[PDB]
């Protein structure tokens, strides 16, 4: 028995939780095991392993006939949220307010993010993951390529063109061929968010193709003619070999393969992971040095960074209708927002992983020595994965190089993290028109977008066209019901 023991008996719960289109829960992870250990509930995956499209196995999952007890996973609010409503996963309120203090706490310390999550209805469906940090992805660039070309880091988007046309045309790798891929990254969708050295917003958030606010007006990036505009240059750039050809494929592995390669020049990532490749390829590539620059500024003179630390994803974990035993699960759930919870779930294992020390968690050196990086490591274990737990910002802070630390207040110090868009409440009304829409409207957005950047479509010669689907999918519309959700919170 344990103190953290939320029932007598062990007790075995069918999850289905498929994340990040590559993983699944796997009870014999180190970190499932010590929860078992810890909780005495059990999560038996119900998932199909060898998958890779998430949304479409909570789809099939939703339509099998035969609900799991607990459903989990990242981009999952706003079915969480509809299904929830439908009668898919039960209301969370009453089990909090009674069973669950640690959530309970959090929410009434973190009533914004309490909000955030509840459905039009007033009940929480999920338990979020909660991300803990300030900044999110930051400007890396090639150093060792800027000193052997003896160019300067660039400081505005003229000098950004030069600078990666240098890389392309001046064989800074050394292998007399031109095969340097300036432009690289893992996240496709940052292809579009360089619309941003133009001037044109590419999200409003941290969640990519997110609205945002302009002097109390609810818009959508995508819609704007800035974008317009902003997506000839990008389209150019891809026309010119600027950008990775594949960059709407390669994805997950882009840094190993196109650094580990010493290929590529030039991305928008993440500034602890991003950083652990100087010390990671410092052997397979030699001389190998990115090193963390401020925005270059863009075409109207704004130096920006979109990107920004979410107060709580749209990531989690729910109770369905069909779990008999929602007092156990809830007390579960709970354990995540507890101090012995949130060691495990943030740094894995005891004695494996990390020691607690001066009472509180070190990850042992072997973790910290490895190249690869440390979340990286824990996903693999069951860590930093993406249920309801409170994410703890030490653990980064643990891996996080001075090197990037000083990126890091480079950016802080700056003020060039936009502020995010936090989102509206809507009644159950103007979601449903959300719900109706807003999927299909995005889709569209993307398979547009993809076109204009590979130059299948011209952005000019279509823009009227794009106008018009947007307006015959109900993006329209969708914007209408935000705004009468943004006015009643805000205005009147
Ligand atoms: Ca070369």
Do not use: C
């Amino acid at each position: 028995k344990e103190a953290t023991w939320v029932t007598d008996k062990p007790l075995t719960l069918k999850i289905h939780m498929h994340f990040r289109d590559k993983w699944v829960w796997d009870e014999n992870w180190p970190v499932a095991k010590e929860s078992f250990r810890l909780t005495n509930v059990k999560l038996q995956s119900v998932a199909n392993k060898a998958a890779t499209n998430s949304q479409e196995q909570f789809n099939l999952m939703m339509a099998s006939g035969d609900l799991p007890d607990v459903v989990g996973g990242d981009n999952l609010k706003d079915k969480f949220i509809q299904y929830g409503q439908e009668g898919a996963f039960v209301p969370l309120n009453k089990l909090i307010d009674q069973y669950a203090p640690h959530i309970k706490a959090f929410f009434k310390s973190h009533p914004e993010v309490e909000r955030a999550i509840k459905a039009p209805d007033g009940n929480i469906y999920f338990i979020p993951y909660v991300p803990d940090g300030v900044v999110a992805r930051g400007y890396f660039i090639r150093e060792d390529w800027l000193k052997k070309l003896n160019l300067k880091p660039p400081q505005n988007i003229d000098e950004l063109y030069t600078v990666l046309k240098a890389f392309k045309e001046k064989d800074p790798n050394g292998n007399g061929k031109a095969d340097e891929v300036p432009f690289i990254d893992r996240h496709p969708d940052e292809v579009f968010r360089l619309v941003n050295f133009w001037g044109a917003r590419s999200s409003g958030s941290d969640n990519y193709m997110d609205f945002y606010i302009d002097n109390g007006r609810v818009k959508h990036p995508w819609a704007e003619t800035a974008f317009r505009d902003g997506m000839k240059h990008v389209a150019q750039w891809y026309k010119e070999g600027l950008i990775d050809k594949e960059i709407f494929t390669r994805k997950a592995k882009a840094r190993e393969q196109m650094f580990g390669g010493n290929l590529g020049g030039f991305t928008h990532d993440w500034f602890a992971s991003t950083m652990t490749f100087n010390e990671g390829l410092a052997k397979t590539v030699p001389g190998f040095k990115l090193i963390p620059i401020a925005p270059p500024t863009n075409s109207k003179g704004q130096r920006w960074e979109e990107d920004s630390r979410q107060k709580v994803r749209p990531d989690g974990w729910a109770i369905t209708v069909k779990n008999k035993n929602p007092v156990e699960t809830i007390k579960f759930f709970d354990f995540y927002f507890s101090r012995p919870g949130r060691d495990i779930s943030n740094f894995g294992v005891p004695g494996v992983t990390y020691d607690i020390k001066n009472g509180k968690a070190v990850f042992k050196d072997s973790v910290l020595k490895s190249p690869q990086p440390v979340n990286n490591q824990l996903y693999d274990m069951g860590a930093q994965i993406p249920i309801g737990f409170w994410q703890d910002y030490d653990y980064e802070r643990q891996w996080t190089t001075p090197e990037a630390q000083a990126g890091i207040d480079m950016y802080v110090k700056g003020k060039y993290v936009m502020p995010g868009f936090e989102g509206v409440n809507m009644t159950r009304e103007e979601r449903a028109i959300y719900d109706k829409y807003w999927a299909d409207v995005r889709t569209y957005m993307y398979e547009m977008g993809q076109a204009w950047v590979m130059g299948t479509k011209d952005v000019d010669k279509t823009w009227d066209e794009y106008q018009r689907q947007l307006k015959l999918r109900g993006l329209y519309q969708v914007l209408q019901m935000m705004q009468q959700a943004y006015d009643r919170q805000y205005k009147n």
